[PDB]
């Protein structure tokens, strides 16, 4: 065609978001800072291990992480177990890190761990097969279901209908109350409760549920269909098998006993808690955010990085039309799994830091004009 | 006929769009259901039916010939009216434009996009439960078979009341009129709309076959059936295709209601089946177009003589009319047919199945024993 | 009403904004249009759409390609399989591996980048990577490259910023007999331009269990597989495998039997007959002290294995030199470390360390693992699905010649015949404005071509295009005519190009290709039927609404009666073409005829198809008599009847129309395997299923 | 009810009646297990296992006590007194090796296999162990008739009612828009080259001087390659059917509810284009099953005999013409398609002649 016509089309065209068209998994995973070379997965591990530092005994200390050499990786993969070195020849993106704990100096044996090594365009090969890792739309704060209210925690997954987790019964209610008051003070969850629930301890959270969140059971203000104000986590569901091992390792020093340890029990517990495939064994069998790549094309904007999953699709009414669907999602795009058009990624949305979905300004008048025309009956 | 090929272009759209009676029905129209479905749609439905207006246009000539539907043309050349949500909730303000002049407002197009959302709720449980319903109906309907042409010559004529709604179900049926021998209805009688007419049904005629019927008892539907064809399965098939087409208001509730009536104990056990046929007829024919010759077979398949002596066999006179449950019919009769239904091991450890009683014969009996002649 | 005004931006439509007239089509068909995108392969002939919106410029900037992630400098440039002169002079280098050092950083991290010959994500569908000729010449061991300098672009990305997702075809709307149940009557010359590419990979092993065979050569050479850049045989057998025996050496280990292929007692690999070999990868265990393969068969294997071992040895030597130079300060990317441990897995272990046991997803290899990757071009004949970027999709049911296609009175030849009556049923009217307005466009572009001295339906040369431009008044009148046509069609594009510098170049770029590319975004102040009535009720800008001549099913030149308009439409090919077919006269049995493994040793599938379910045998018991419907199951569940039907097929003078195959006097009823198994399992319980009067 | 003493004296095989009676697992698990193993009153008389067992009478029952506390059945005593011989003989049979399937890195076994406890074995303890083994026999046979027979994947509903037939094919469908007959099928080259292999072998051993190995190589070589000899042999094999139009075959639909889902056609033409892999069907037969061109794969079986082709005449394209709902009405499957009707609409319903007033004036 005419080059001036394509120039005028390029001059009058809204540009897509470069962070979402290239993949937000590229941004929120393996993005090195200019100060030092540390990926965002290693930063998430470093921010997860210091939370459970108050559950550690005196002298025990987690001391960063270091990148492993491939000469160490080849010996750690092909480890002789039964006089046979089983090398798995398969194209798989992985990289190996360490843990490097210490107990009053004299640091112990390092525990290597594998990491999935994502690539550009939300694409990763595992065990020969290609896969796509999509982010999950997660609301900031608490979730309001049709019956009860749900809060996310690092170790408990309880709902709220008179139910909690679980002569000689006097020590069970004491061992529960021991861990109930200090282990539920995770700092990242205190930064997650910035929606107005400003608590310090869980005993104030149970009070503020009863005096402020008590009307969220029958006359809640949550619209239950709006996609505004979300976190868009991709790393919270990817490391779900590693956080479980972190919580089970933190249960050793607090829930079981609080006595003096030695290096022979600490090395045994470190070998029994952190194996080689902690975050790798349940990646392609239970994680609903990882899908099989079946795109016979060259563009990644069609089915590569334009897939979103809800909070119910990650586990492997609410389908009311909302005016926020046309802003952050893609309406008139109805697959078989999500026929309402809720799981879709529109590139023309405003996303700031840490995946926080913020609203725009140029389309706000049309959305406010169309929203009040919906819910009037 | 190769020179006369129908075509479609922009000119065929502009020929029907530029009519003044169509353009008058799209301007000065209040957004009301009466103002759209009765006022706006009527002024274009009265000009689509005019045979002296559009001569040569392929769309109108295909509409009058039964190819194109008029329900899909009122949503394009006239005002589209009130698309719905996932649930059956209508909206207050409808869409102004149609499909020729497209929808270009965000609110109206977002309502219109929810009209195609209900066309994807195609979960596998529905296709599983309709196949389970077909397997439950046909396995018990397959007992009666091998109708014979002729006349069994019985005077045990039953009597049924005929109404307006079930008159199509009595199309091919022989009845007894005054000063006459036999006559078939064929469905053109405005009279006999409230009386109780004496018919000739399968309940109570005498044929020498233990599981067969005659042509005059079944009606005029038997000559449309081929000679080597099971009359037992085709009743459940003729029910099930209309049920699946109703599946594809709350047709699953209708399917479970027909399951509870036919293959359960939800019906009150009447003394005679002549009062069980019109209730099932007025329950079925009000929503599913089904002939009563199939309903007679579906009722006769649950009939057992001498229930106090465990003689699980079909009686040839239908005047007895003793009905029991569906599972007792599946287990205590024709074990070769019992191996085809669920819970195969329960007829095995039963003391009633180890004694030689005279019983019926399922067609599956040859597949169980491998294909032996005796 | 306000039919002209509209407020919908491109920011609110995710994938719906790729085509205009989105409000005219239905919601379900508009969703099926987005569903059809993402199932489309890349054909060889790609071109831009005639009605370009503002969306295709944004989808062309985010594709799968080989780009530099950061400002860096190239350190080393390696390549597998070096091409020179001699006996080891294999051509068509598939991949090149380059290593860079990340410039402008506090820690100089080292990275790696592979440039392959192709890229494929689907199992049997992929596209080639054409290389940028400017960047590929500047590939040096001392060269600084900036961020996002693309290498090896795809075929859909053109020189300017566009995206080719389909082919423009002259679609005629006729009620032909071939257009039954969404049927397409495609031209033979149009299907040559819609030709997808399939990249496949076949892998085999040959060790102590079995060894190779001698194809692709005479009795003075041994070649178990074709070389890189060779053609596969007319039969699809590639690296057929024969079992390992000792006492059958003068019978099977002879140069006559190594050349011929036995279809039974062997394991071959069937692929595509006409296809070029692209890549070859050979793994080898070289630590066993007995060599299982005989001599004279391991030349072409080691010819690739030595080059691959030298490549991986240099790849490990570079990392070892970088580790010896920069001690305790090396930073590496997450792709390079996997490449180094892969190079360590390929290279053999020393004698002081135990040897490796290589596995491929719980499948061990035995001393050889050869995988080839080949490329074929698939020509569509039947059961190919197509879509005009709307809800209306179809399947090609009849392929006519180029001379038997519908042609109008202006010489335009049709490429597709689609039934028009399905438009009013499914309510997809966006195909009406695309077929119509383009018919008002090309007939304009063929008018301004024929108004001067030129020839229509033919690309003009430079000597004529440089001689037409001498008349400035004629090109000014043509520019005014094009501006009037744009004012009729698209007022935003017309107001854009009202201030156009050097307007003779617009006339040149219109008369070069024979179509004016019309820009039509999603926010247009256009009354569509008013523009239709302006195009119809006018002397100029009117399409040729005349008669159309064609050829019917018989041999006759047929001219239609009604005036038929032919217009352009942008078509594409879809997924699920006809290749998953099966045919089996005999299937292997269980030690009861079910097989589920890597079944690629026969052309097409050889598995038994469960055509007789429970409902199928119920309908065959009711409609067909219960007698003859048990013989169909007894000819399968009994192996003696399965041998007897082949004996009756092979002993009769007529293979078809045989009266009796399995007589019930020698092989009677009662020899079924699951029936006897159930009878035995019930006999050990203590009861029996019989009857007596 | 089968006499267990009648089956163990008329065996005349290996006559190894002592399986557990002689072996004692003294270095015999490597030999007796892999080479050999790799009327039960407890089935019927099992209404007494709620929280107490009425079968605590261990040994020497001498069943003559009519103490029956049961409300479900009253003819159980008549069933006992009809054939009193029930679990009386000493020779109980052992299930065969085909019922238990045993490889790879890990030995995989199935959970209903719990009958190997009887192969591994004072009188008051041995007599209790015999009834322990008899209760294990009943617990094995009940769970094997419940989990391997009563389930929908099982011996009864999957293998006893037919599965995976031979001489079959499965492919997508197209239409024939031609002057043809209502029962004509067009098999492609790749399907017809493998469905008719022994027919081509017979024709190549009859018309040419070839062995069966060279004939098999000529058949398997020309599957993805067109040649004139295989096409001429296909035309000869079509022309060999003297009273029929070709080879009789059956054609199915995967949802099979109505009569039209299972039809019988005749193979009449093998296609020459190797790229076309689809079976082309008649236009008028498209309506009786719900079959469209939406990428669906449909099944086909080949009738070998003349008697089988005559017996398959009960399912024909002419059998579903008459409706099964109305007594005198042809069903709607005879109705023509859209573009077939529209040409007759444009031809007949046209302003062709002046009206009757102008015609006679
Ligand atoms: Zn009768």
Numbering used by the authors:
A (entry chain E): 2 to 167, 322 to 471, 483 to 543
B (entry chain D): 137 to 384, 552 to 677
C (entry chain C): 2 to 592, 597 to 698
D (entry chain A): 7 to 44, 150 to 213, 216 to 234, 247 to 486
What did the authors write?
We resolved structures of the better ordered core regions of the complex by single particle analysis to a final resolution of just below 3.0 Å (FSC = 0.143), and a maximum of 73% of the complex to 3.3 Å (FSC = 0.143) after extensive sorting for the clamp. The ‘clamp’, a flexible element whose position is key to regulate the entry of single-stranded DNA into the active site, is also conserved and positioned similarly to its situation within the M. tuberculosis open promoter complex (RPo) structure. This region, lying within the gp55 N-terminal domain, exhibited particular flexibility, and was only ordered in the small fraction of the data yielding the most complete structure. The ΦKZ nvRNAP complex retains the conserved β/β’ architecture characteristic of msRNAPs, with a shallow active site channel running along the elongated side of the structure. One side of the enzyme is formed by the β’-like subunits, gp55 and gp74, with the β-like subunits gp71-73 and gp123 forming the opposing side, the internal DNA channel running between them through the centre of the complex as expected, and illustrated by complementary electrostatics. The DPBBs that form the catalytic core are contributed by gp55, which contains the universally conserved DxDGD motif that coordinates the catalytic Mg2+ (417DFDGD421) between β5 (403I-M405) and β6 (Q422-L427), and by gp71–73, which contains the two conserved lysines (K386 and K394) believed to be responsible for the interaction with DNA. The structural elements that govern the msRNAP reaction cycle are also conserved in ΦKZ nvRNAP; β’-like subunit gp74 contains the ‘bridge’ helix (L242-Y279) and the ‘trigger’ helix/loop, which switch between alternate conformations during nucleotide addition, although only the first helix of the ‘trigger’ loop (residues T365-V383) is well-ordered in our structure, as well as the conserved Zn2+ binding domain (C288, C341, C350, C353), known to interact with the promoter during transcription initiation. We also conducted subunit co-purification experiments in which we co-expressed pairs of subunits with one affinity-tag and assayed for recovery of both proteins.
Whereas almost all known bacteriophage-encoded RNA polymerases are single subunits, ΦKZ is one of only a few viruses to encode multisubunit RNAPs (msRNAPs). The ΦKZ non-virion RNAP (nvRNAP) is formed from these early genes by five polypeptides: gp55, gp68, gp71–73, gp74 and gp123 (10). Both gp55 and gp74 exhibit a degree of homology to the β’ subunit, whereas gp71–73 and gp123 represent similarly weakly homologous counterparts of the β subunit. Our structure confirmed the previously predicted homology of the split β/β’-like subunits, but further revealed that subunit gp68 is integral to the ΦKZ nvRNAP complex, interacting with both gp71–73 and gp55.
